[PDB]
Amino acid sequence: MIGLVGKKVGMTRIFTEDGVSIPVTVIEVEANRVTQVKDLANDGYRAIQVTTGAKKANRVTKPEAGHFAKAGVEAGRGLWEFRLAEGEEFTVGQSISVELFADVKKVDVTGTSKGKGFAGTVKRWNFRTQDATHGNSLSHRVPGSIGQNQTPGKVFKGKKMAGQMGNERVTVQSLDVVRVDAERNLLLVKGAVPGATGSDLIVKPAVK
Amino acid sequence: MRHRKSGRQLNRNSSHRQAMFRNMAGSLVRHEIIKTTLPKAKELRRVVEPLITLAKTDSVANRRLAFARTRDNEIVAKLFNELGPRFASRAGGYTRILKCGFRAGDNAPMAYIELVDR
Amino acid sequence: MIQEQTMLNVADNSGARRVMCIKVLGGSHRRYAGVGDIIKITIKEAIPRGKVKKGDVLKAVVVRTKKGVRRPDGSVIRFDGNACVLLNNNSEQPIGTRIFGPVTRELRSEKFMKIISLAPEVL
Amino acid sequence: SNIIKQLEQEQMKQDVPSFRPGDTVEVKVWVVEGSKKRLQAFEGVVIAIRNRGLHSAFTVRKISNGEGVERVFQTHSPVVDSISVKRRGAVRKAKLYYLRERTGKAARIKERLN
Amino acid sequence: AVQQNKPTRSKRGMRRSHDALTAVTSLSVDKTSGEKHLRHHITADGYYRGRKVIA
RNA sequence: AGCCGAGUCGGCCUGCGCGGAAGAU
RNA sequence: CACAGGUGGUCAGGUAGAGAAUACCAAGGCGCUUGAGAGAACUCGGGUGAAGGAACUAGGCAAAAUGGUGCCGUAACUUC
RNA sequence: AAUUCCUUGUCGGGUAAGUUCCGACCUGCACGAAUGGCGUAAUGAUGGCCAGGCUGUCUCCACCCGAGACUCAGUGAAAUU
RNA sequence: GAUGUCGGCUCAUCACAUCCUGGGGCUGAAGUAGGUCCCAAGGGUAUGGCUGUUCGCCAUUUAAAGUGGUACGCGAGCUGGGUUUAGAACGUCGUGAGACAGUUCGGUCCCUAUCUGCCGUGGGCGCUGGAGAACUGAGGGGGGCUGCUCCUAGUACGAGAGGACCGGAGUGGACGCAUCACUGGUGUUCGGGUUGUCAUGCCAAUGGCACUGCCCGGUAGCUAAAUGCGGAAGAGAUAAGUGCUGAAAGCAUCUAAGCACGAAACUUGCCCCGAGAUGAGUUCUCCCUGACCCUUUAAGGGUCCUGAAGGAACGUUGAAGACGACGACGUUGAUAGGCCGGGUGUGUAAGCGCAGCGAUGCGUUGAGCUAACCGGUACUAAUGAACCGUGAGGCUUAACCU
Ligand SMILES: *C(=O)[C@H](CCSC)NC=O
Incomplete structure (x- = not known):
């Protein structure tokens, strides 16, 4: 099924009457507005495109403004896409x-x-x-050995080494x-999700 | 990492930082316009403006606090007799930074900093 | 948080005074033991005419720790030391007849009801 | 954050009495044993307080059956039924961790009666 | 660690292919005196954005 | 052979194939 | 080499201190002849650490620990 | 045994578990009396073994304060081929 | 005219003659538990005492503590206990200098990375008019482990003692990813106590130096010991193995023609990268519609007028970052600093009055001070301009419009 786009607000807790404390993440989800429907005859697959939020006029370039004006909706801060299943229908301009x-x-x-x-x-x-x-002698956090001798005489592909860490796309599954x-x-939702306060999130029904 | 942190190290240690900024605040109050490096000028606002805010109410306790933070009676007297009354009805922003060229000896970027009613 | 070489006090009247942990039972490569877990011990100090001697090897269960336990609402309970109760190596039942000091509700199982019933206070 | 502040202010208690480090307090908590519910008491000296809104907490120390025990309570949980103040104490610090090394006559605390 | 063969002038040039300097795109003209200056900097006579600041 | 009507039994010499056949970038 | 090395004699202020030890100052003398920014891995010199306390290692290597004055008190052995 | 190959000899003590340590037996491969034999209080930046206290030595690493490493301007090397 | 040789530490990769988990045939296989052979390499596969040891013996664990190759893998990655220099001693051999795969105590481990390789991150040009966005998926990588309790059931089996297959539900060990609400560590940029000495004329009050002088608490950020989640179920084609129908060979026979089952191995299903995929793909939107000259006559060279969509540069900067790169903002403005209110931490300031001979105590007073946090506010700094990028986009053939 389709999902939605939202924003990370923060973390808090909920108290129950039996004396349990549930830690929660708070997600703000405004209305998602449909900008384009893609079908099999013209594109080769079935999907919808959506926007959300708001954007200032003098930051919207003419190509983007024309694309929004075709659908007849106000400009937002981005565009995202979702695949459709059999028996799902939507129309342009819908909320x-x-x-x-x-x-x-x-x-x-x-x-x-x-x-x-x-x-x-x-x-x-x-x-x-x-x-x-x-x-x-000067070897406290260094990696150690990285290979063998004359056979094979090289370093294999995929070796583990030092480098850039983080700032990538991550998914976490099956949250209550x-x-x-x-x-x-x-x-x-219950538990922690990736990102920092104020970042964008995509929410979908669980696949497993 | 330095996420959400504030402050500049300037390749010194803490005692040296404190002493240098004390001296520089004194010089700015005395002359009303000085020339220095751009990062130093950007750091000096956070030390000089709170003193001017403190000097808008005149009392023995406030004078003693200013003396603790400057160690100069001439500077204290100027602060409480001339600059508080001058700025009585302004909400922040008592200083101004203007970029000038580069230094001949080592190619450092430079700026003037001055009080806004000189 | 109890591991190998840790020393513990004894909360029963079987004759032992100080014991040392020599193994954390359970699964492979297991690190720590907490309140409610069973460990293997050797006796380091005993009083003259008790039911156990110095140098024996037995089993025991942990009843108090300095790290404590958490509760479903986020609370904590901590103690000033580490203490245990001696069990029989085959049947896993207490050797003594009395219990000294408070214990916790973590022990309320079909395996440790004698301890729960003999204790002077269950927190 | 206004959103989180609003979500948090609808769960807070409004009956909590006022107390300070060094006082003696009694706390009543719920206990479940099978299908039965009852209340159990815990009395002792207050050594630390954390003032953090819905996330406030406080710590109590006592000597029980020859052993020292400490408990950290979350102030706004419904497990806690009531808090009462039995004595008022006179100290200078905000945290009283030095009491962990004292016993008996050396651990006494003077009375305030402000 | 040192080389086993002497590198060539062609390789020298290939490595230096990233060393060229860049020139300033354009200068700015003050609205009162007509001098040229670096953008967001004062002039050599003491003007900035039409006002005399330094004597 | 199994339960009526043309074939069926087992040794010999020789051509080409089949199993026996598990290793390290 | 305008080199973190080597080189005999004389003079001896104040407060605290047994002291020519050590800390802070006087008279006097100096800031050591490349600088300016940033605040990654790793290396050098240091401060702090939940629970455990030699389980490390050829080896308690290294670190941590003890540390002043007055008084009470002090074992086997001994060439006393 | 600063001496013993076979050998981690056999017996006792210390540890949950001791090829090292301490006490004994005698089958001394190959001790032994001024190229001295057996003992000995005190002394040692000397070799071996066990305990109390103590700890980032370790389970298992986390954060911070300084000097380089990185970027700009000035000067400006080496082994090798 | 030099290829560093035992054991340990760090980090690995392959084979299958398989230690565990998975699927089977025979049993001198009643059940539980065992013996032997066939198939299968996806994942997993101990801590200590002694000794320089690899081995080995011993103590206590585990589903299990596999066997081998890789210069007996790995010193321009670390150690230096053992072998294998010069000092000294014992036993033994020699008249002696000395000697012993016999013992014993002591004994300097160098190198700033040009080329290949590997982990990360940029600049150029190409893809056929230029520009801003959203995608398809050829191809590549990551992941794949397992214990104990309960029900079915004290049933099937068995003289009894004992005690299941098949199918359901819960709670753990080890490992991996993310996060800071809770429990805590750090917090030389926040508050307080106190020892020695120097100064601000002096009292009172403050500052400098002694490892942040020595200490006691602690905001934001980072973070594990803290707390959320994961390994699958389904589908296709099969291995050893089990079958249906059926002749050659009037019977029988899983196979020759036909048909059906069957495993953590294979191909998918889950997560991440991905059109330099030169075989350079698709969809939506936006911008440019002027005059002349020469010549060797062509995908030709030049002059005047014109300068769009967009981009780059500069400034104020970020939970983005070695530098480049990436994201937010530039008066039609909350990007940074300051300023106003709050919260958090420490814990009752200075000045004045009262009691006491005095050290000190009490009132004004939960007072004063308060970084990186929350909610607001144009006081200061983010300047009009200038620069790059053009002027309707090649040839041949086919099918449709005129
Ligand atoms: C033999 O004794 C050994 C051989 C050296 S070969 C590099 N040398 C010892 O000094």
């Missing part, structure tokens, strides 16, 4: 709200993770450190849906 998740029990959430920059093997791949005493609030455009 989709967070009441779509009224009866769903579990979701998958996708976002961009925090960036750590250039990282060593101890932090990036969980290598073990060598001795801090007993005569070690704790609350759906339609008068305030809120969705509350």
Whole structure:
């Protein structure tokens, strides 16, 4: 099924009457507006494209403005796409709200993770450190050996080394849906999700 | 990583940083326009403007606090007798930075910093 | 958080005073033991005419720790030391007849009801 | 964040009495044993307080049956039924961790009666 | 660690193919005096955005 | 052979194939 | 080499201190002849650490620890 | 045994578990009396073994304060081929 | 005219003669538990005492603690206990200098990476008028482990003692990804106590130096010991193996023609990269509609007028970052600093008055001070311009419009 685009607000907790504390992530989901429908005859597959949010006029270039004016909707801060299943239909200009998740029990959430920059093997791949005493000579956090002798005489592809860590696309699966609030455009899920406060999130019904 | 942190190290240690900025605040208050490096000028605002905010209310306690933070009675007297009254009805922004060229000895970028009613 | 070489006090009247942990039972490569877990021990100090001697090898269960336990609402309970109760190596039942000090509700199982019933206070 | 502030203010208690580090307090908590529910009491000295809105907490220390015990309570949980103040103490610090090394007459605390 | 063969002038040039300098795109003209200056900088006489700032 | 009507049994010499056949970038 | 090395004699202020030890100052003398920014892995010199406490290692290597004055008190053995 | 190949000899003590350590037996491959034999209080930046205290030595690493590494301007090497 | 040789540490990759988990045939296989052979390499596969040891013996665990190749893998990656220099001693051999795959104590481990390789990150040109966005998926990588309790059932089986297949439900060990609401560590940029000495004329009050002088608490950020989630179920074609119908060979026979089952191995289903895929793909939107001259007459060279869509540069900067790169914003404005209100931490400031001989105590007073946080606000700095990029886009053939 289709999903929605939202924004990460923060983390809090919910108290139950039996004395349990549920930690939750709060996601703000405004209305998603349909900009384009893609079908088999003209494109070769079946999907919808949506926008959300708002954008200032003097930051919208003429190509983008023309694309929005064809559909007849106000400009937003981005464009995203979702694939369709058999027996699902939509029309251009239509609005989709967070009441779509009224009866769903579990979701998958996708976002961009925090960036750590250039990282060593101890932090990036969980290598073990060598001795801090007993005569070690300048080799405390270094990686060690990286190969064999004259046979094969090279380094194999895919070796684990130091480099950039984080700032990439990540998915976390099968989170319980704790609350759906339609008068305030809120969705509350159990547990942690990738990203930092204020980043964009994609929410879908669970595949497993 | 330095996520959400504030402050400039300037290739020094803390005692040296503190002493240098004390001296520079004194010089700015005394002359009302000085020439220095751009990062230093950007750091000096956060030290000089709070003193001017403090000097808008005159009391023995406030004078003693200013003395603790400057260690100069001439500077204290100027702050509480001339600059507070001058700025009584302004909400922040008492200084101004203007970029000038590059230094001949080592090619450092340079700027003037001055009080806004000189 | 109990591991190999840890020393513990004894919370029963079987005769032992100080014991040392020599293995954390369970699965392969297991690190720590907490409140409610069973460990293997050797006796390092005993009183003259008790039911156990210095140098024996037995089993025991942990009843108090300095790290503590968490509760479903996020609370904690901590103690000032580490203490245990001695069990029989084959049947896994207590050797003593009395229990000294408080215990916790983590032990409320079909395996440790004698301890729960003999304790002076269950927190 | 206004959104989170609103979500948080609808779960808070409004009956909590006022207390300070160094006082003696009694706390009543719920206990479930099978299909039965009852209340159990915990009394002792307050050594630390954390003021963090819906996320506030406080820590209590006592000596029980020859052993020292400490408990960290979350202030706005419904497991806690009631809090009461039995004595008022006179101290200078905000945290009283030095009491962990004291016993008996050396651990006494003077009375305030402000 | 040192070389086993002497590198060639062709390789020298290929490595240096990233070393050229860049010139300033354009200058700015003050609205009162007519001098040329670096954008967002003061002039050599003491003007900025039409006003005399330094004597 | 199995339960009525043309073939059926087992040794010999010789041509070409089949199994016996598990290793390290 | 305008080199973190080597080279005999004389003079001896104040407060605290057993002291020519050590800390902070006086008279006097200096900031060591490339600088300016940034705030990654890794290397050098240091500060702090939940629970455990030699399980490390050829080996407690290295670190951590003890540390002043007055008084009470102090074992086997001994060439006393 | 600073001496013993066979050998981690056999018996006792210390540890949950001791080819090293301490006490004994005598089958001394191949001890032995001024190229000295057996003992000995005190002394040692001397070789071996066990304990109390203590800890980032370790389970298993986390954060921070400084000097390089990185970028701009000035000067400006080496082994090898 | 030099290819560093035992054991340990760090980090690995392949084979199958398979240690565990998966599927089977025979049993001198009643059940539980075993013995032997065939198929299968997806994932997994101990901590200590002694000794320089690899081995080995011993203690206590585990579903299990596989066997081999890779200069007996790995010193321009680390160690230096052992072998294998110069000092000294014992036993033994020699008249002696000395000697012993016999013992014992001591004993300097160098190199700033040009080329290949590997992990990350940019600049150029191409893809046929130029520009801003969203995608398809040829191809490539990651992941794949397993214990114990309960029901079925004290049933099937068995003289009894014992005790299941098949199918359901719960709770753990080890490993991997993300995050900071809770429990905690750090927090030389926040508050306080205190020892020695120097200064601001002096009292009172403050600052500098002694490892942040020595200490006690602690905001934001980063973070594990903290707390969420994962390994699948389904589908196709099969291995060893089990079958249906059926002749050659009037019977029988899983095979020769036909038909059906069958495993953590194979191809998919889950997650990430991906059109330099030169075989350079698709869809939506936007911009440009002027005059002349020469010549060797063509995908030709030049002059005047014109300069779009968009981009780059500069400035204020970020939970983005070695530098480049990526994201937000530039008066039609909340991008940074300051300023106003709040919150958080520390813990009752200074000045004045009262009590006391005094050190000190009490009131004003939960006072004063308060970084990186939350909600607001144009006071300061983000300047009009200038620069790059053009002027309707080749040839041949086919099918449709005129
Ligand atoms: C033999 O004794 C050994 C051989 C050296 S071969 C490189 N040398 C010892 O000094």
